[PDB]
């Protein structure tokens, strides 16, 4: 169905999908990604920090206008309020909630970098509560972390091993 073959038998993270003329941009396997960027400069760099990103978290319960934004609310002063931020946390740690606040007169990028705790959890029985951060138009986005993170004055580097 075409997606885009490149050379050394590997799959391109970037995909022009000539379905409607829009930008999928999957990695090597078939799982997709739930969203839309049709008519857009979405290359491999602009889609490989966007693949390092857990997209949607759970949206049962939004609650608790409290424990407020933790370090900054960049506007996003270009015509992509997506990709300008895409970078805007990444080139740095902990952007761990995040999202772009779509209300109408004006559009801000949120940034909360760490909470107390997001679970009260064969330990099996337990699973995630991560959004906690209000009831707008935003809807949250996740950094998927694996690699240099920080939290609560404690740094983490990937040693490995």
Same mark, same amino acid.
């Given at each position: 169905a075409g997606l885009q073959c490149?050379?050394?038998?590997?799959?391109r993270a970037s995909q022009k999908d000539r379905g409607s003329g829009?930008?999928?941009?999957?990695?090597g396997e078939g799982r997709r990604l739930p969203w839309w960027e049709t008519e857009a400069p979405l290359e491999d760099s602009q889609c490989l920090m966007m693949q390092k990103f857990e997209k949607v978290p759970e949206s049962k319960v939004i609650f608790d206008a409290n424990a407020p *934004?933790? *370090?900054?609310?960049k506007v996003p002063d270009s015509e992509?309020?997506?990709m300008q931020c895409l970078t805007d946390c990444t080139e740095d740690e902990a952007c761990s909630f995040f999202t772009v606040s779509t209300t109408e007169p004006e559009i801000s990028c949120d940034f909360y970098?760490?909470?107390s705790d997001? *679970?009260?959890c064969g330990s099996l029985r337990c699973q995630v509560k991560v959004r906690s951060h209000g009831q707008d138009?935003?809807? *949250?986005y996740?950094?998927?972390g694996q690699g240099s993170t920080t939290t609560l004055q404690k740094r983490f580097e990937p040693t490995g091993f």
């Open positions: 490149d050379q050394n038998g590997q799959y829009k930008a999928f941009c999957v990695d *934004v933790a *370090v900054r609310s992509f309020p997506v970098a760490w909470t997001n *679970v009260a138009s935003p809807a *949250v996740l950094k998927k």
